[PDB]
Paper text:
We have demonstrated that two non-homologous specialized enzymes from E. coli are as little as one mutation away from being physiologically relevant replacements for each other.
The inhibitor, (R)-1-aminoethylphosphonic acid (l-Ala-P), is a phosphonate analogue of l-Ala that is a substrate for the transaldimination reaction, in which the Schiff base linkage between Lys-34 and PLP in the active site of the resting enzyme is displaced by the amino group of the incoming substrate. Thus, l-Ala-P forms a stable external aldimine with PLP in the ALR active site. Formation of the external aldimine tilts the plane of the PLP pyridine ring by ∼10° toward Tyr-255′. To test this hypothesis, a cystathionine-PLP adduct was built and docked into the active site of ALR(Y274F) using GOLD. In this docked model, the Cα atoms of l-Ala-P and cystathionine overlay, and the distal carboxylate of cystathionine is perfectly positioned to engage in a salt bridge with the side chain of Arg-280′.
Numbering used by the authors:
A (entry chain A): 3 to 359
B (entry chain B): 2 to 359
């Protein structure tokens, strides 16, 4: 039933493709949230050539080390408790630093080794980071800290890089460049969108997440293959039933789809209890034996119903592709009006993980 | 302190008892499919040794239960997907639904060391799984003649619209079910949460509570589990990781979708759609910080959610956040987000820590 198939060859291709688009920049492969659904630890072991791995939280970084990953790991949101710092230091984790608590803990600690730090600037997203009017003094303190390995590096993040007509990205960049002028540290602002559409945003390090897995960061119906990146994940399953159904007959909860002809319906061992979106409407495409058929009626917790046709020869046990070869996850996102980020990431533990190539 | 689902075992024990009170002559299939609706498959079964059976979606789930030392009957609600599984099903004493010719034939043909208990699945208008009325009679008779099937054969079905008491579909499913079961031996089951709570003439021999067992309403009518005397089981909790100044006219989050009308303080929660919190949440969805309600502002992101705390708010990094739980029913989050409560509780990721209390 519900299996996630992760293509190791597509992953390696994608990193090397992204090196070619930003060839003067180092790569933090962003692998937080179980590597956007593809598997934290297996994704990292597929990519030895990364210059670092990026995570959201310290626990993710420790999971990497527990599985034998020795590469530098960047804590994108820094650390949430002052007692974390000896572990961070001894693990050689690079840490973002974005608030007073973290900075004060760095100043007051006594650590066996200094830690590499990326100071986070709020250039416009207004999520994490030090606002421009607090930044020089916050920076100056970091440069004066024995527990911080000089130089201090500088990181920000784009809020609207997927909308080039906007002008938000160029403002974010001017705040960034203004602050960076005359400082020695490395600089990083671009994730998938910056790498693809803003070559003046590449600087020393870039940070691919979504494009590394061969899925587009943009909402214009582009797919990773538009950018020469190969889709990594297939979500697949099989039919468990093929049944007769009649004209005028509803299917599923609320009877939300009614058949206008006699037909055969298929039942897929996949639902929202696996991660598949309950917001997917009737007519959403699935592939059965490599041909597109439509979802009919509401998605259920463990089952989806599709219309196969009145004399279709599909059988229980036949392969189904929710997204993969012939059906990019961006096309599912468009039809369901869910971010492709969320579709690939918000899958449950019920799905089996399979690795190929 | 980070993304954590707290499971209140006392609430769970109460709910099963409370449901027995509402269906006093009926045995209980505790439905624990999809990791017990997000609450933990094995731990939820461990909390409920009073259940008469456990109900799962797939053979793999049943086996996991056996693997963690659960010994009670397990019902395979969808049956089995490969004939080669029948020996395992016999020897684990799983009960299985049977809904198609493939399964029927597999039982007729197999040589098993012990027969298996069977619930014949009747399609009564859901049109998802099950044998149709015009086929069901011959299919039934074949099950009564199979030496690999315990007699009598039991009969199951499931409602499509039990959550609309104004509507006639439930009464038409019942009449179809009642016609078929006239004069047959063996146990009858058609009610799950909706059926149990609203339709007492559907209770029959076995009822199969899912969502209401976890203290969550199966309706989209503003009712909560507490409306029916069931106590919420799950709390989705986390922490603030930042409290930040913010100015009038400044937007927050991706696409700058929310702009503050005043200077304020923002809080950032260690929670996002990579944990299972729905990206769909609009600005103004409630979150509890230090017990009090504050609105989501800007888009839910993969690992973080931003909330608007107010300009001299004294919340700090490290303080507790409740996404749903005590003081904030998941049904409220369902309604504000236009997500089904089912999906909300169930579609969490493996990054969430599980903790069990009482
Ligand atoms: C600091 C930072 N640097 C890089 C990335 C990778 O992003 P892409 O997938 O757009 O390349 C992110 C993640 N961004 C979203 C998934 P989210 O904000 O929802 O976590 C990030 O936060
Ligand atoms: C046969 C069967 N018997 C009982 C239950 C329990 O239902 P409640 O959660 O409404 O009590 C279900 C589950 N039904 C939906 C969650 P879904 O169809 O989305 O999986 C089921 O399929």
């Amino acid at each position: 039933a519900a299996t996630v198939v992760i293509n190791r060859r597509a992953l390696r291709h994608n990193l090397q493709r992204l090196r070619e688009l930003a060839p003067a920049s180092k790569m933090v492969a962003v692998v937080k949230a179980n590597a956007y659904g593809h598997g934290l630890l297996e994704t990292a072991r597929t990519l030895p050539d990364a210059d670092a791995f990026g995570v959201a939280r310290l626990e993710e970084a420790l999971r990497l080390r527990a599985g034998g990953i020795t590469k530098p790991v960047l804590l994108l949101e820094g650390f949430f408790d002052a007692r974390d710092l000896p572990t961070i230091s001894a693990q050689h984790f690079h840490t973002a630093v974005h608030n007073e608590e973290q900075l004060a803990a760095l100043e007051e600690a006594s650590l066996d080794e200094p830690v590499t730090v990326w100071m986070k600037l709020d250039t416009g997203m207004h999520r994490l980071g030090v606002r421009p009017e607090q930044a020089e003094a916050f920076y100056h303190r970091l440069t004066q800290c024995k527990n911080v390995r000089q130089p201090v590096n500088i990181v920000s993040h784009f809020a609207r890089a997927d909308e080039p007509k906007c002008g938000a990205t160029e403002k974010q960049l001017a705040i960034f460049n203004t602050f960076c002028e005359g400082k020695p540290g490395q600089r990083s602002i671009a994730a998938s969108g910056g790498i693809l559409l803003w070559p003046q945003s590449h600087f020393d390090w870039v940070r691919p997440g979504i494009i590394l897995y061969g899925v587009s960061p943009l909402e214009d119906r582009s797919t990773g293959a538009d950018f020469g990146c190969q889709p990594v994940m297939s979500l697949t399953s099989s039919l468990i039933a093929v049944r007769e159904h009649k004209a005028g007959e509803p299917v599923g909860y609320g009877g939300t789809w009614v058949s206008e002809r006699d037909t055969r319906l298929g039942v897929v061992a996949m639902g929202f209890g696996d991660g598949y979106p309950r917001a997917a409407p009737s007519g959403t495409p699935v592939l059965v034996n490599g041909r597109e058929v439509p979802i009919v009626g509401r998605v259920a917790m463990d089952m989806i119903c599709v219309d196969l046709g009145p004399q279709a020869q599909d059988k229980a046990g036949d392969p189904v592709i929710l997204w993969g070869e012939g059906l990019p996850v961006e096309r599912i996102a468009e039809m369901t009006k869910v971010s492709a980020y969320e579709l690939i990431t918000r899958l449950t533990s019920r799905v089996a993980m399979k690795y190929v190539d």
